[PDB]
Amino acid sequence: TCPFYKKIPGTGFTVDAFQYGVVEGCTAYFLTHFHSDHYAGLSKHFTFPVYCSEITGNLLKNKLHVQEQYIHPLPLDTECIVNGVKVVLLDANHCPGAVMILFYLPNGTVILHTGDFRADPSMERSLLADQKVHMLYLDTTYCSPEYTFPSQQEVIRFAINTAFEAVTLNPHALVVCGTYSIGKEKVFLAIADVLGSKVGMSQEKYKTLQCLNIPEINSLITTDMCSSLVHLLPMMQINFKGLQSHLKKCGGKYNQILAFRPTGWTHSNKFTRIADVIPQTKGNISIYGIPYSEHSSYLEMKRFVQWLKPQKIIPTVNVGTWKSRSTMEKYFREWKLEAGY
């Protein structure tokens, strides 16, 4: 059944709750972003109102074929009224079109639902600064102190410098980047920009990117693989067998592959700095796992919460085990005692 952490009290609303059939009492279904564990269940047969960003609404219409009459896009940073309740959508710093949602309950309670987010100090100067938030529905993906990672800018610097050096040493090297969802487009777009190439990809993936309102996108991507030396493939193909196979397909235009796997976290983070990352190599193929995260680190999460000072926290991730739930609740209490709220 629909879990309680997907329901908004004092409303008929649910958040990211599309795989439970008709939720009894739900008058509006919000969708924070277009990732499959969140939209699971949506299709052309859905006949309830869906509230989301413009970009998520483009994806619902073009990729899932949801009928336009049931898609309600909202502008960001704007007080809107939905079924009699004031709401605001804020940028979540996750993937394209991802939002956090502020609900202003008729009884005076304010609730923030982060969706999936990567906390940032810039959030401390949005509309969140203007009133108190009582309850926080929190993306706790990396809520444990082992989870450190570098800034996105540091990671993209490494990738740009690595790729440019390799292709300048060998003009017959191919760059390959893995993907399995929207998100992390800066990785392949930044590499292609330093090399003066467009990024080549499948027709399905090109369609997906053309929904994202990225400026000048027609200048940066293409479905002509032959004219490109940065290729995008399914994350599943980013291994030695998959890459050897791909190289055979390029007809001797290339003699070396340099590949990137933008992972979340990996246990080489606790020891190794970004400057010191190395690839796995077999023959003329090298694979780099780079820690490009679109979720908060532990310290970023902690700073956001200690700034916001909520009265109650409801985790939305890692809630399935008692050991995880108990651990998270311990950190929340530490943060509260340290900061004095």
Q: How far is 60 from 77, CA to CA, in rounded Å? A: 21
Count of residues making up the chain: 341
Shortest gap between Cβ of 50 and Ni ion (angstroms)? Answer: 17
C-beta of 141 vs 228, nearer to Ni ion: 141
- Establish if 35 lies at the interface with Ni ion (CB under 5 A): yes
C-beta of 99 vs 232, nearer to Ni ion: 99
Q: What share of the chain is helix, strand, coil (3-state, %, to 5)?
A: 35, 20, 45
- Both tokens of residue 89? 């959508």
Q: How far is 98 from 59, CA to CA, in rounded Å? A: 12
Q: Pattern of binders to Ni ion over 181-220, x per CB under 5 A?
A: ----------------------------------------
Shortest gap between Cβ of 245 and Ni ion (angstroms)? Answer: 30
Spell out where the chain has E strands.
7-8, 13-15, 28-30, 50-52, 71-73, 80-82, 85-91, 99-104, 110-113, 135-138, 173-179, 199-200, 221-222, 230-234, 256-263, 280-282, 285-291, 312-315
Shortest gap between Cβ of 303 and Ni ion (angstroms)? Answer: 21
Q: Which stretch binds Ni ion (CB under 5 A): 33-41, 102-110, 134-142, 170-178?
A: 33-41
* CB contact at 8 A, 17 and 29: yes
Shortest gap between Cβ of 183 and Ni ion (angstroms)? Answer: 7
Q: Which stretch binds Ni ion (CB under 5 A): 28-36, 56-64, 141-149, 240-248?
A: 28-36
Q: Tokens 């450190």 — which residue?
A: 148
Other Cβ atoms within 10 Å of 254 Cβ, number: 18
C-beta of 235 vs 250, nearer to Ni ion: 235
The residues near 146 (Cβ < 8 Å, ≥ 6 apart) are 269, 270, 298
Shortest gap between Cβ of 146 and Ni ion (angstroms)? Answer: 21
Q: Which stretch binds Ni ion (CB under 5 A): 31-39, 64-72, 218-226, 326-334?
A: 31-39
* CB contact at 8 A, 174 and 248: no
Shortest gap between Cβ of 98 and Ni ion (angstroms)? Answer: 7
Shortest gap between Cβ of 111 and Ni ion (angstroms)? Answer: 20
Shortest gap between Cβ of 189 and Ni ion (angstroms)? Answer: 19
C-beta of 32 vs 228, nearer to Ni ion: 32
C-beta of 184 vs 231, nearer to Ni ion: 184
Q: Pattern of binders to Ni ion over 104-143, x per CB under 5 A?
A: ------------x---------------------------
Residue type, 240: F
Residue type, 104: Y
Give just the sign of the alpha carbon dihedral 32, 1, 49, 87.
negative
Q: Which stretch binds Ni ion (CB under 5 A): 8-16, 35-43, 68-76, 148-156?
A: 35-43
Count of residues of this chain found to bind Ni ion when the rule CB under 5 A is applied = 2
Spatial CA neighbour of 165 closest among 139, 133, 191, 202: 191
C-beta of 35 vs 231, nearer to Ni ion: 35
C-beta of 51 vs 254, nearer to Ni ion: 51
C-beta of 18 vs 158, nearer to Ni ion: 18
* CB contact at 8 A, 201 and 284: no
Q: Which stretch binds Ni ion (CB under 5 A): 30-38, 198-206, 271-279, 320-328?
A: 30-38
C-beta of 286 vs 297, nearer to Ni ion: 297
Shortest gap between Cβ of 235 and Ni ion (angstroms)? Answer: 15
CA 229 centroid distance within chain? 26
Binding site for Ni ion (CB under 5 A): 35, 116
